[PDB]
Amino acid sequence: AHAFWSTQPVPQTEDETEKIVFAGPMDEPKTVADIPEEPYPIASTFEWWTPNMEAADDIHAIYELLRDNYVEDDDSMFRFNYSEEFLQWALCPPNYIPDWHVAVRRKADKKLLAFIAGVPVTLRMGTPKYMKVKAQEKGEGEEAAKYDEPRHICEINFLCVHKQLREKRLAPILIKEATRRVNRTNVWQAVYTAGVLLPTPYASGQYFHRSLNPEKLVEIRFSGIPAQYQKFQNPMAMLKRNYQLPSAPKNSGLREMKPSDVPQVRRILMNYLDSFDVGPVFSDAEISHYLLPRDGVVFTYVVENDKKVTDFFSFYRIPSTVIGNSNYNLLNAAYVHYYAATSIPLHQLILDLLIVAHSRGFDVCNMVEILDNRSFVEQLKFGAGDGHLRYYFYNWAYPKIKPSQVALVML
Ligand SMILES: CCCCCCCCCCCCCC(=O)SCCNC(=O)CCNC(=O)[C@H](O)C(C)(C)COP(=O)(O)OP(=O)(O)OC[C@H]1O[C@@H](n2cnc3c(N)ncnc32)[C@H](O)[C@@H]1OP(=O)(O)O
Numbered sequence: 403a404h405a406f407w408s409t410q411p412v413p414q415t416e417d418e419t420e421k422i423v424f425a426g427p428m429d430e431p432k433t434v435a436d437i438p439e440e441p442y443p444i445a446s447t448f449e450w451w452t453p454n455m456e457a458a459d460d461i462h463a464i465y466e467l468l469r470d471n472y473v474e475d476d477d478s479m480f481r482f483n484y485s486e487e488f489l490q491w492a493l494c495p496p497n498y499i500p501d502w503h504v505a506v507r508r509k510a511d512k513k514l515l516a517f518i519a520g521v522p523v524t525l526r527m528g529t530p531k532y533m534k535v536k537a538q539e540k541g542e543g544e545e546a547a548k549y550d551e552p553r554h555i556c557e558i559n560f561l562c563v564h565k566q567l568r569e570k571r572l573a574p575i576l577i578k579e580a581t582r583r584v585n586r587t588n589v590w591q592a593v594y595t596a597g598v599l600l601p602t603p604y605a606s607g608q609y610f611h612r613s614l615n616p617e618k619l620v621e622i623r624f625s626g627i628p629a630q631y632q633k634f635q636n637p638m639a640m641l642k643r644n645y646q647l648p649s650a651p652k653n654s655g656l657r658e659m660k661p662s663d664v665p666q667v668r669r670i671l672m673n674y675l676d677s678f679d680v681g682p683v684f685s686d687a688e689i690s691h692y693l694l695p696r697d698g699v700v701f702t703y704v705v706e707n708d709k710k711v712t713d714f715f716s717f718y719r720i721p722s723t724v725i726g727n728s729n730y731n732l733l734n735a736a737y738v739h740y741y742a743a744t745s746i747p748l749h750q751l752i753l754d755l756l757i758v759a760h761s762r763g764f765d766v767c768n769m770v771e772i773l774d775n776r777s778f779v780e781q782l783k784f785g786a787g788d789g790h791l792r793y794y795f796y797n798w799a800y801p802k803i804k805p806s807q808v809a810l811v812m813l
């Protein structure tokens with residue numbers, strides 16, 4: 403049933419998953435010197451390419467591939483349109499490895515046909531808490547704790563094959579070549595998400611959406627006027643009233659983050675992310691890169707009380723192409739990113755997020771039910787979307803966890 407994934411070091415069924423009790427590697431330990439030094443052989447009409455993310459033309463090529471061929475909704479009404487500035491930010495964090503960005507071009511005209519990207523992440527991925535309690539019952543705490551240390555691994559994203567080349571087994575070729583480049587740098591695990599079911603996720607969660615401009619969302623059919631709103635003499639006036647927001651944040655210590663906040667935001671975020679079984683560890687350079695405001699890309703605000711940062715939130719921007727509306731070309735979406743609340747309830751912190759996003763002209767705020775994102779769904783008028791986001795590891799055995807134990811945001 404899975405000619406490619408059946409050959410790979412991942413759990414093969416949910417039943418195999420069920421019997422996983424400790425974190426650890428799936429495969430034979432291997433060494434760097436065992437891995438072939440040359441790229442995988444490929445069809446003579448194609449060539450492997452390592453883009454230069456410092457070259458505008460190279461970023462543009464990836465931008466165009468994704469604009470026309472990346473993820474769509476179910477009914478082909480929307481397609482993500484990551485910007486060039488966003489791609490530079492997502493693909494080039496501190497100490498990124500250029501060779502982890504793998505592409506296939508057509509030899510004759512250098513047209514970009516397929517891409518996959520790997521970036522470094524330092525991840526805690528040791529045995530989850532509920533299994534550590536089970537281990538204590540069995541007298542097995544040391545084996546359960548063996549891989550507690552954060553690990554330097556690969557996060558894989560942006561896998562894309564051009565529409566004209568779909569169903570020709572090119573995606574396995576990409577994933578094998580990515581794996582070889584990552585293994586040649588002595589890294590043997592990867593983490594990735596997908597909106598489809600593959601062998602075999604360790605967590606799964608619903609998407610959630612908070613309308614900010616309901617009149618536009620209904621014009622472009624992202625939203626409907628829900629059936630209950632018809633019994634009303636006037637639907638859209640009532641929908642706008644339901645989702646109205648104040649003009650300005652309610653917390654008077656809220657301001658944009660600046661470079662001098664980096665140490666305090668690192669500390670409050672790392673103390674919060676400790677709570678979770680799987681989550682990133684960030685240096686000051688990584689907090690600077692992923693959280694300092696960047697025009698059109700990432701937006702971050704801190705609550706400062708008595709010259710101390712006590713809370714913060716961040717959200718990032720991804721517009722989507724609206725396929726065939728005469729009125730609107732683009733959905734302007736905000737996505738909840740990292741945050742930490744120490745001084746006020748989380749719902750009060752995130753209400754300020756919605757206020758800021760709305761004032762900045764975003765149409766919708768979206769998120770997955772990781773972190774403590776459930777705690778504020780109902781009070782802040784989020785609704786569940788369609789399908790689920792699935793979280794996976796490569797070459798890592800891991801017990802199933804709830805998505806409220808996951809703290810890694812994937813862009
Ligand atoms: C240590 C380092 C390890 C590094 C690597 C870690 C693993 C990284 C793995 C990648 C994580 C990506 C994270 C993200 O970016 S998820 C976002 C994926 N991108 C899109 O959805 C964009 C639009 N769609 C496409 O571009 C194509 O449909 C893709 C490229 C998805 C498949 O192209 P195509 O439709 O032309 O198919 P094929 O004939 O070439 O190949 C069919 C085989 O591919 C398996 N397939 C289908 N979809 C996915 C998917 N999303 N992850 C993994 N495998 C997938 C499928 O089950 C089948 O295998 P098998 O069932 O026969 O066995």
Ligand SMILES: N[C@@H](CC(=O)N1C[C@H](CO)[C@@H](c2ccc(Cl)c(NC(=O)Cc3ccc(F)cc3)c2)C1)Cc1ccc(Cl)cc1
Pocket residue numbers: 473474475476480481482558559560594595596597609610611720722735737768769770787791812813
């Ligand atoms: N490797 C993953 C990365 C990922 O997990 N994402 C990337 C995506 C944007 O940051 C995020 C996400 C977070 C929260 C929500 Cl509500 C949605 N979904 C939507 O925005 C709806 C939507 C679906 C398709 C569209 F073409 C446009 C909008 C998507 C989840 C690839 C992927 C991309 C997009 C999706 Cl929907 C699912 C998976």
Ligand SMILES: [Mg+2]
Pocket residue numbers: 563567568569570571572573
């Ligand atoms: Mg293919």
